[PDB]
Design a protein around this ligand. Sequence first.
Ligand code: CLA
Ligand code: CLA
Ligand code: CLA
Ligand code: CLA
Ligand code: CLA
Ligand SMILES: CCCCCCCCCCCCCCCCCC(=O)OC[C@H](CO[C@@H]1O[C@H](CO)[C@H](O)[C@H](O)[C@H]1O)OC(=O)CCCCCCCCCCCCCCCCC
Ligand SMILES: CC1=C(/C=C/C(C)=C/C=C/C(C)=C/C=C/C=C(C)/C=C/C=C(C)/C=C/C2=C(C)CCCC2(C)C)C(C)(C)CCC1
Ligand SMILES: CC1=C(/C=C/C(C)=C/C=C/C(C)=C/C=C/C=C(C)/C=C/C=C(C)/C=C/C2=C(C)CCCC2(C)C)C(C)(C)CCC1
Ligand code: OEX
Ligand SMILES: [Ca+2]
Ligand SMILES: [Cl-]
Ligand SMILES: [Cl-]
Lengths: 450, 35, 135, 34, 78, 334, 341
Amino acid sequence: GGRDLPSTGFAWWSGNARLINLSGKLLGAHVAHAGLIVFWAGAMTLFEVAHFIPEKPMYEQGLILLPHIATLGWGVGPAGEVTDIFPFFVVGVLHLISSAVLGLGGIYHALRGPEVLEEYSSFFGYDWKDKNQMTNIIGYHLILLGCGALLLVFKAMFFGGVYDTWAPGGGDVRVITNPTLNPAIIFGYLLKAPFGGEGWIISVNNMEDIIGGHIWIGLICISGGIWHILTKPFGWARRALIWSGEAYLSYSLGALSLMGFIASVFVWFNNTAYPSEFYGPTGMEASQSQAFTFLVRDQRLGANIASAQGPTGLGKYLMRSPSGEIIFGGETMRFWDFRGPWLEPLRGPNGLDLDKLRNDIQPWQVRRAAEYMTHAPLGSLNSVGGVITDVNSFNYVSPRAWLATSHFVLGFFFLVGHLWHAGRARAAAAGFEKGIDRETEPTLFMPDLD
Amino acid sequence: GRIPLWVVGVVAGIGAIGVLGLFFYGAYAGLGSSM
Amino acid sequence: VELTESTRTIPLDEAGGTTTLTARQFTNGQKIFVDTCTQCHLQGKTKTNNNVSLGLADLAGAEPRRDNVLALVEFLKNPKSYDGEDDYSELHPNISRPDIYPEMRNYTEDDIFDVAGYTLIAPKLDERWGGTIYF
Amino acid sequence: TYPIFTVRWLAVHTLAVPSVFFVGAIAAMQFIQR
Amino acid sequence: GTTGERPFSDIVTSIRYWVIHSITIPMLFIAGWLFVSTGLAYDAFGTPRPDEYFTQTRQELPILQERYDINQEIQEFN
Amino acid sequence: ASLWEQFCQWVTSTNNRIYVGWFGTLMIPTLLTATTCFIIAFIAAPPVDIDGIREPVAGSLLYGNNIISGAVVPSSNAIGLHFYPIWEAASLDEWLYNGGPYQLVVFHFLIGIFCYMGRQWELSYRLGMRPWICVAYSAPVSAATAVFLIYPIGQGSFSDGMPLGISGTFNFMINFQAEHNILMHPFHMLGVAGVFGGSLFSAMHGSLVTSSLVRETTEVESQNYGYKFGQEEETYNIVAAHGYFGRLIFQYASFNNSRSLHFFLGAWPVIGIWFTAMGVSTMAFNLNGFNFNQSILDSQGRVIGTWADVLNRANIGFEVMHERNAHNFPLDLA
Amino acid sequence: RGWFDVLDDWLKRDRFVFIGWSGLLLFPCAFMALGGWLTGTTFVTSWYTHGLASSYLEGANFLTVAVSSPADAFGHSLLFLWGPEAQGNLTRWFQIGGLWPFVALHGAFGLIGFMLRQFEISRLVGIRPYNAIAFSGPIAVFVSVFLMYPLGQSSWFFAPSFGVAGIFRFILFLQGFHNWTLNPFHMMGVAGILGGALLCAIHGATVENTLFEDGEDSNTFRAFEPTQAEETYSMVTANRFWSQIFGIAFSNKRWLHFFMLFVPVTGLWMSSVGIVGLALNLRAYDFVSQELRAAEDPEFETFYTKNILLNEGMRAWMAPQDQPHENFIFPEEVLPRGNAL
Ligand code: CLA
Ligand code: CLA
Ligand code: CLA
Ligand code: CLA
Ligand code: CLA
Ligand SMILES: CCCCCCCCCCCCCCCCCC(=O)OC[C@H](CO[C@@H]1O[C@H](CO)[C@H](O)[C@H](O)[C@H]1O)OC(=O)CCCCCCCCCCCCCCCCC
Ligand SMILES: CC1=C(/C=C/C(C)=C/C=C/C(C)=C/C=C/C=C(C)/C=C/C=C(C)/C=C/C2=C(C)CCCC2(C)C)C(C)(C)CCC1
Ligand SMILES: CC1=C(/C=C/C(C)=C/C=C/C(C)=C/C=C/C=C(C)/C=C/C=C(C)/C=C/C2=C(C)CCCC2(C)C)C(C)(C)CCC1
Ligand code: OEX
Ligand SMILES: [Ca+2]
Ligand SMILES: [Cl-]
Ligand SMILES: [Cl-]
C-alpha cells in the first residue's frame, strides 16, 4: 500500500483515501476509531463520576452521559435521586477497558496485519463492487443492531426497567410489562406531521410506546439482516445507485446527518426518553413553568387568574389556543402543546382546569415549576446561565442545549460530507472527478444555448 | 548536527498550546474571572 | 480599595450588635451563594418572586427584619412569608428539610452564617443589587 | 555562507523580541489575585 | 526564488541557533514576567492596581473634566 | 424510445436554455409558488398579528409601507410551530390575519433552494464537471435555513423567523443581539471574518489579475476586449502577479498555483458562512455569545466595567423595549 | 554615482522584506501603530477617560481589551505627548487616552505608506497599479470612520475604540443613535461586502470544479505550472453551467476579475460616504410619513416603527454608562420599557 503522493495520487491531507482499496488497513482504521469512541465513553463517564455531586441535580453539573445511564434505570431511584454511584462507575470502566482491546486490534490491523483481506479470507475479504458480499456485511450488522435494540427491551422488561418520568406517584424506575405492540400506534408515530402539536416521532410520550418500538425495530432489523444475507440487490437498485466505497460512505453520511438532526430535535423537545429530572427542563417546560409559577403566586395574592385580562386584552394567565384549548397566557402561548408530568395533573379534557388550578396545586408542583423556570435552557458560551443580559454569578448551561447544538452542527457538517462524497462518487464513477479532458470536453460538442 | 524540523515544530506547538491554555486558565482564575 | 474591615462589618442582631466576617468567610459565603442561590437570587434579585428581593430595603422591611445575620440564618433554617405568617419550609430552600432540598443538606451552621453575611455585604459592593429583574 | 545579520533579521527581531516579552508579562498576569 | 538570506528551516534546525535561543527567548519571557510581577507596569503606565480604582475620598468614576490641567485632576482623583 | 424515456431525456437535457433536471422538476414549482405569493403579499397583504396579542403589523406596500419598511410578516406566535396551510383557515382573511403567506413562502422557498443545490450538482454531472459548486452554495443555504427554519424551531415559533423584508431583517438582528449577544459569539466572528476576508480576497484577486493583464488592446478600447471567450491562452501573467504580491508581503505569503489560490478563494468565505450559520443555528437553542458582565472586580469586590458591560447596557435597552406588549412574566424564556 | 541613486539602489534591493522609499514611512508608522495597540491593550487603562478596564493587566480578555478613545474633555485635541495636556509626562499621556490618537495617526500614515508601497512595487515589477486602487476602499473606511466621524462629533471620545468589544460598542451605538442600518449608504456597503464574499466563493468553486484534467493524480493541485500558457480551467464549461443554472454567466474573464475588484471596493466607498453623513448627525433616521401616521393612527405599526422603539430603548439604557462625562442621571422611572420585561 502506497503511503505517499507519487504512489497513490492522494496528498497527505487526503491520506485516509489511500485506504479505500486496502481492506485490512481500512479495517484497522475502523477498529481503532471504534476504540476511540468507546474510550471516550468510558473516560468521559469516569470524569463525570469524579466530578459528580450526588445530591445536586444532574443537569446542574455539565453531565451528558450519566443522564443516559440514569434513564436506563441504573444508580437512581424515585424522582431521579442517586442511590449508588457504582453503576455509572462500572459502565465507565467497562468501556475504558474494552477501548484498549479495540485500540490493540486496530493498531494491529492498521500496522501489522494483512493490508488486503481478499487473499486471506472469502468471508472477510470484500470488493466494493461485490454487491452480494456488501449486502452480507449490511445483514450481519443489521442483526447485531436489532440485537442491541432488543437489549434495550430486555433491560426495560426483565432487568430492572427504565426511568419513567410519567410514573404514577412521581417519576421512578419502572419495569415495562405491556409494551405497545399495536403496529397502528407504533407506525402511526412515523406518519405524524413534524410540526407543532404532532411532532412526528419526537412526540413519543410513554415508555410502553418506546419499548414496543424497540421490539419492532429489533424484529425489522433482524429480518432485514437475514434478507440482505440471503438476497442480492435487485435490478432497479443496481441501476439507480452508485456501487463504490465512496458512494457507500456518502450514503452513510446522509443517514448520519438525518439522525443527527433527529437527535437534536429529540433532546430539545422530548422529556420522556430525556427525563427533565436528569436533562433539566425543555425550553417549552421552562416557559410553561414561568407562566405557572406566577399563576400560583398571583392567585395566592388573591388575583382571579381566570378573569384577569392582560394589557393586550388576552388573558394574563390563561387564554385559548387557536383550537380552543385552555392554555397558559403570555408568549408561552407558543408552547401550549407542552406535556409534563407536573403539569398534566392540572389539565382537564378542555385543557387547564380552573377547579384544579384553584384547589389541587401541590407544593412539589410549585417547587418543580420554580426549579424548571430558573433552569431554562438559556445560557452563554462561557456557561453564564439565564438570559444573556444577566451578570456573572450563575454557572449553568442546560445539557439539552449542549446536546442539541452539538448534534445539529454535526448533522449539518455530515450533510455537507454526504454532498462532498456523493458528488465525488458520482464523478469518479463517471470518470471526470480529476477534471475535464481537453480533447473530449463535452461542452465543445454541445450546441449553443442561443 | 541538525535538529529535525518536525521536532522543532512539535516543541513550538506544544509551547504555543501551553501559553494558550495558560491564558484560558486565567479566564477562570485571578483577575477577570468574576469571582 | 481592599475588602476592608468596615466592609465586612455587618449587623449581627437587631439589638445593635455587629460582627465582622473574615476574608475566608466572605469568600465561602460568596461560593455558596454562587453555587446554591444565584439560580434565583442572581445579583440580589428574585426571579420567581421579585416582590421579595435581597435588596437592603427589602431585607429590612421583613417581619422581623432580615437585615442582620441572625435573622437571615433563622430564615434559612425556617423560611416564612414577608410578614412572618405562612410556613415556607416546603417552598423555600432551607437546611431543616433535607428531603426536599438535598442540595443544602451538607451546609453547616458556619456555612449558613457565611452565606447570610455575604448576602448582607454584597449590596454594599453593587448599587444594582436587589433591583428590577431587568436593570 | 549566508550573512547572519540582514534586514530580514531585524524585521524578525523587532517583532519577536517585544512579543515574547509581552507574552511573559501576560503570563504573569494570569496569577494576579484581586 | 532565494533573495540571498539563509532559509529559516536551515536556521532553526541548527545547533547554534538553539544554543542562543534556549537562553534568549526564556530571558525575554522572564523579563516580561518580572515587569508585571514586581508591580513595575502599574507604575509605568499608571494603570490602577486592584485596590486603587476607588479610594476613601472617591467612590465614583474618575472621569477627566479639565481641558489642560490633568496632572492636577489625576492627583486629586488619587 | 418510450414516452417516459423521452421525457427523461428532455428533463435531463443539457441543451435546454435553462437546465431543468429532476431537482428542477421540484425547484421550479416551489420557487415559482414562493415568488408569486411573496410578490402578492408584499404588495397587498393585510396586517399580520405576528406577536399573537391582536396587534397586527402592516407589512405590505398598499397598507402604508415603503420598499424599505415593507415585509411579509412571520406567522402569529399563537400558531407557534403548527403547520398552517390555506386549507386550515376558515377564510383566506383569517389565513392572512395570522400570517399564512409567511409559512407558504418560506416552506416553498426552503424546498426550492435545497433543490437549487441539488440542481447545481445535477448539471455539473451532466456537463462532466467536478461536483462541488453545490458544496459552496450550501453555505448560504445553511444560513437561510438557520434564519427561516432552525431558529424558529429552537425558539418554538415561526413568529421568531426572519421577516421577509429589509426593516424586518434589522428587527430580527436587533432582537437577536438583545437575546443572544451574537456580536460576542465566536461563530458570528468567523462569519465576519468570512465576509470581510471574502471581500478582501475578491478585491485582491480581481486587482492582481487586472494589474497583470497581457497587453492585447489599444488605449482607445476597453481592456476587456483583450480577452476572447473560449481562448486557449491565459489573459494575465500569474508570474507577474506573484512577483508583485510576494514583494508586497514576502515571497512565501503569495500563491504561485492558481488551483491552490482558487481553492482558498472558495473555501474561506464558504467556511466562514458555515460557522455563522451554525452560530445562528445554535443560538436557536439559546447557547448564546460570550457573557463577560461583571467579570472584572476590584479587591473590595466592586465591578469595574469593560466594553462588554457597555454592550450589555445596549442589549438591555434593546431587550426591555422589544415586543413591548407581548411579555406578561419577568423572564423572556423564548 | 550620486548618493540619491545609491540610496535608491539599497532601498529597492531584492531582499526577504522589500523596503523601498515607501518603507521609510510605512515601517516606522505601522510599527508605532501596532506596538501602541499591543501596549495599550496589554497595560493601559481607560479608567480616567471612560471609567472602564481596557487592558489584560486589569483582567480584560482579547475580546474586551482596547485602546480606548480619549476623554471627551479634550475635544479633538491631537494629544501629542509634548502637547499641553500630557506635557511630556508619559504616564499621564497613557492615562488620558493619548495612545488612541497615537495609534490612529501612525496607522493613517502607515496606510498611506502601504498604498505608496503598492504603487512603488507595481512600478518596479511592471504591472498596472490596480491593487493600490483597490486598497482605496479600506483607506476611505479608515478615514471616514476613525477620523471624520469623530471630527464631526464632539471629540475623539466618540471615535471607535481599537478593540473587539470597543468596535461592537461603536456598531451598536451607531444603530441606536443613528439608525445606521436604515442608511442607504450602509445598505450599498452591505451589498458590496456580501457580494464580494459571494463572488469570492463562486469564482473559487467554479474554477476548482471546471479544472482541466492536466494530471494523473486525484490531487489536482499538482497539475498547474505557473509558467504554462494554457488556461487551467474551462471558461466555456463554466459559462454554460452558470448560463443554464443562473440564466446568465460571465463570458469575459477580464470583466469577471474587474467585477471582483469593483464590487467590494465600491461598497466600502459608499458606506464611507454614509459615515461621513453620520459625522454631522445627517442620518437616515426616520421615515417622516410613517412617523406622522403612527402619531395620528395608533393602530398603525411596521417593522420600521418597531426598530425606532428599539433605538429609543438602547439610547436611554446605554447613555449614562457609555458617556460617563455627561453625568447622565436617568432615574429608573424614566427608562422606557415594555410590559413586565
Ligand atoms: C481516527 C483517526 C485515524 C485512524 C485510525 C487512521 C488510520 C490510518 N491512517 Mg490516517 N490520518 C488521520 C487519522 C487517522 N488515520 C488524520 C487525521 C490524518 C491527517 C494528518 C491522516 C493521514 C494519513 C496519511 C497521510 C496516511 C494515513 C494512513 C493510515 C493507515 C496506515 C497507518 C500507518 O501506517 O501509520 C504509521 C504510523 C505510525 C507507525 C506512528 C504510530 C501510530 C500508532 C498507531 C500510535 C498509537 C498510539 C496509541 C496511544 C497506542 C495505544 C496502544 C494500546 C493502549 C492499545 C491507518 C489505517 C496511511 C495509509 O493510507 O496507508 C496506506 C497514509 O499514508 N493517514
Ligand atoms: C457531543 C459532544 C459533546 C457534548 C454535547 C459535550 C458537552 C459538554 N461537555 Mg464535553 N467533551 C466532548 C464532547 C462533548 N461534550 C469530547 C469529545 C471531549 C473530549 C475532549 C469532551 C471533554 C470534556 C471535558 C473535559 C469537559 C467537558 C464538559 C462539557 C460541558 C461543558 C462544555 C463547555 O463548556 O464547552 C465549551 C465550548 C467549546 C469549547 C466550544 C467547542 C467548539 C468546537 C470545537 C467547534 C467545532 C465545530 C465544527 C465541528 C468544526 C468543524 C470544522 C470543519 C468541519 C469545517 C457540556 C455538558 C465540561 C464539564 O462540565 O464536565 C463536567 C468539562 O470539564 N467535556
Ligand atoms: C470489526 C472487528 C474485526 C474484524 C472484522 C476482524 C477480522 C479479522 N481479524 Mg481481527 N481483531 C479485532 C477486530 C476485528 N477483526 C480486534 C478488536 C482485535 C484485538 C483483540 C483483533 C485481533 C486480531 C489478531 C491478533 C488477528 C486478527 C485476525 C483477523 C482475521 C481472522 C479472524 C479469525 O480468526 O476468524 C474468525 C474468528 C472468530 C470467529 C473468533 C473471534 C470472534 C471474537 C473474538 C468473539 C466475538 C467478538 C465479541 C467479543 C462479541 C461482540 C463484540 C461486541 C463489541 C458487541 C479477520 C480478517 C487474524 C489475522 O489477521 O489473520 C490473518 C489475526 O492474527 N484479529
Ligand atoms: C442500514 C440498513 C440498511 C441498508 C443500508 C439497506 C440497503 C439496501 N436495501 Mg435494505 N432493508 C433494511 C435495511 C437496510 N437496507 C431493513 C431493516 C429491511 C427490512 C424491512 C430491508 C428490506 C429491504 C428490501 C425488501 C429491499 C431492500 C433493498 C435494499 C437496497 C436498495 C434500497 C434502496 O434503494 O433504498 C432507497 C429507498 C428507495 C429507493 C425507496 C424510495 C423511498 C422514497 C424515496 C421515500 C423515502 C422516504 C424519505 C426520503 C425519508 C424520510 C425520512 C424518515 C422516514 C426517516 C440496498 C442495498 C432492496 C434490494 O435490492 O433488495 C436486495 C429491496 O428490495 N431492503
Ligand atoms: C465517517 C465519516 C467520514 C469518513 C470516513 C470520511 C473519509 C474520507 N473523507 Mg470525508 N468528510 C466527512 C466525513 C467523512 N469522511 C464530513 C462530515 C465532511 C464534511 C466536513 C467531509 C469532507 C471531506 C472533504 C472535503 C474531503 C474528504 C476526504 C475524505 C477522504 C480522506 C480523508 C482524510 O485523509 O482526512 C484527513 C484528515 C484531516 C486533514 C484532519 C481534518 C481536521 C479538521 C479540520 C478538524 C475538524 C474539527 C475537529 C472536530 C477538531 C476541532 C477541535 C479544535 C479546537 C482543534 C476519506 C475517504 C477527501 C477526499 O475526497 O478524498 C477522496 C477530501 O478532500 N472529506
Ligand atoms: C499538544 C500540546 C500540549 C497540551 C497540553 C498543555 C496545553 C495547555 C494546558 C494547560 C492548561 C492549564 C490546566 C489548568 C491548571 C490546573 C488547575 C485546575 O484544576 O483548574 C483550575 C480552574 C479551577 O478548577 C478547579 O480548581 C481547583 C483549585 O485549583 C481544583 O484544582 C479543582 O480540581 C478544579 O476543578 O479550572 C480551570 O481553569 C479549567 C479551565 C481551563 C483549563 C484548560 C484550558 C484549555 C487547555 C488548552 C486548550 C486551549 C489551547 C488552544 C490550542 C489550539 C489547539 C487545540
Ligand atoms: C424505536 C422507536 C419507535 C419506532 C420507530 C420505528 C418504527 C422506525 C422506523 C423507521 C423507518 C421505517 C425508517 C425508514 C427510512 C426511510 C428512508 C431514510 C428512506 C430513504 C430513501 C432514499 C435515500 C431514496 C433515495 C433515492 C431516491 C429519492 C429516488 C431514486 C434515487 C435514490 C435511490 C437515490 C417509536 C417511534 C414507535 C417510539 C420511539 C422508539
Ligand atoms: C506605544 C508607545 C511607544 C511604542 C512602543 C512599542 C513599539 C511597543 C511594542 C510592542 C510590541 C510589538 C509587542 C508585541 C506583543 C505581541 C503579543 C502580545 C503576542 C501575542 C501572541 C499570541 C497570544 C498569539 C497566540 C497564538 C494564536 C492565537 C495563534 C497561533 C498560536 C499562538 C499560541 C501563537 C513609544 C515607546 C514609541 C512611545 C510611547 C508609546
Ligand atoms: O416573538 Mn419575536 O422576540 Ca423570541 O425572545 Mn421571547 O419571543 Mn418574542 O420575546 Mn424576545
Ligand atoms: Ca441549584
Ligand atoms: Cl421588536
Ligand atoms: Cl410572557
